[PDB]
Design an enzyme around this catalytic site. Structure first.
Site, PDB file in Angstrom:
ATOM      1  N   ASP A  33       0.786  -1.264  -0.070  1.00 24.66           N
ATOM      2  CA  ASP A  33      -0.025  -0.133   0.037  1.00 24.66           C
ATOM      3  C   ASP A  33       0.953   1.223  -0.028  1.00 24.66           C
ATOM      4  OD1 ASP A  33      -2.745   1.406   1.725  1.00 24.66           O
ATOM      5  OD2 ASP A  33      -2.482   1.048  -0.366  1.00 24.66           O
ATOM      6  N   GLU A  34       1.787   1.297  -0.814  1.00 24.40           N
ATOM      7  CA  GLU A  34       2.401   2.382  -1.141  1.00 24.40           C
ATOM      8  C   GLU A  34       1.909   2.945  -2.483  1.00 24.40           C
ATOM      9  OE1 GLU A  34       6.879   1.193  -1.198  1.00 24.40           O
ATOM     10  OE2 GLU A  34       7.001   3.469  -0.131  1.00 24.40           O
ATOM     11  N   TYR A  35       2.410   4.338  -2.659  1.00 27.64           N
ATOM     12  CA  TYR A  35       2.226   4.820  -4.225  1.00 27.64           C
ATOM     13  C   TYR A  35       0.785   5.056  -4.459  1.00 27.64           C
ATOM     14  CZ  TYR A  35       7.166   4.125  -3.796  1.00 27.64           C
ATOM     15  OH  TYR A  35       8.530   3.940  -3.204  1.00 27.64           O
TER      16      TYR A  35
END
Length: 265
Positions: free
Chosen positions: A126-128
């Site tokens: 759950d990055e970017y």
């Protein structure tokens, strides 16, 4: 060989997944790497229908299409192969699905690729995900729980892992259900650091150490790996193994985890 489960993320945009199998222990001969992760598929956002869809860039697609030579060989050698999925700056994230069916429809897309490419699992990153971009909604309490619950239900025998980062990681409980126990693994996302993940997983399934092969100092690679064993943790995350001769970087950790140096073939 005995010791922590070593993981290796490969940015298939620049490197080959086969580099993971080129490292075995000088002593017992086991693999230096236990898990290989394809970096990475995306959660895309269709601004017309206002729905998320799974997406494979050309290089990722190529890897999947050619599973016979890029993925299968690793699996035959005993190395598991996961597909990592991350958000893009499009607005769609793992924490902003507006419903269970929304969350499930995407889950269905994940297990279908897994079943279709012979993958052993999916990794959540759950990055970017830039919640709010393109008018998407902010994260809620349900989304992640609905998606993990569905994906797990869709594939009870495959590996589902989490990068301990982003709005989703802190949203494992809802409507009673805590999805912490639906994960096989969870790892620190901060390369060159030691950070114990909060997810309620036994130490044996957690990787507080995160390193980037070729970037993190071998001194730090060795330390974090020694620390993994000292503290009784059972997973050790590695990122960005490329096609260069990384035997020294690899040994810096196998020496600590397994007591053996690695050897590239």
């Amino acid at each position: 060989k005995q010791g922590p489960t070593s993981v290796a993320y490969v940015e298939v945009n620049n490197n080959s997944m086969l580099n993971v199998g080129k490292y075995t222990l000088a002593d017992g001969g086991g693999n230096a790497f236990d898990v290989a992760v394809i970096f990475a598929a995306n959660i895309n956002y269709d601004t017309g229908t206002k729905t998320a869809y799974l997406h494979f860039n050309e290089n990722v697609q190529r890897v999947l299409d050619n599973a016979v030579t890029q993925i299968r060989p690793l699996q035959q050698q005993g190395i598991k192969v996961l597909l990592s999925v991350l958000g893009n700056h499009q607005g769609a994230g793992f924490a902003n699905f507006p419903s269970q069916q929304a969350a499930s429809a995407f889950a269905k897309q994940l297990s279908d690729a897994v079943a279709k490419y012979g993958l052993d699992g999916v990794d959540f990153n759950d990055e970017y995900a830039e919640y709010g971009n393109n008018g998407t909604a902010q994260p809620n309490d349900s989304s992640f729980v609905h998606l993990v619950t569905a994906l797990r239900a869709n594939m009870p025998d495959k590996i589902i892992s989490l990068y301990n980062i982003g709005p989703a990681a802190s949203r494992l409980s809802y409507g009673g259900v805590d999805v912490s126990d639906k994960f096989d693994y969870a790892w620190n996302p901060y390369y060159g650091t030691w950070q114990v993940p909060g997810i309620a997983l036994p130490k044996a399934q957690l990787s507080p150490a995160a390193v980037e092969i070729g970037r993190t100092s071998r001194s730090t690679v060795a330390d974090l790996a020694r620390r993994t064993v000292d503290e009784g943790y059972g997973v050790y995350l590695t990122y960005n193994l490329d096609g260069g001769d990384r035997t020294a970087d690899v040994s810096a950790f196998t020496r600590e985890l397994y007591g053996s140096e690695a050897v590239r073939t």
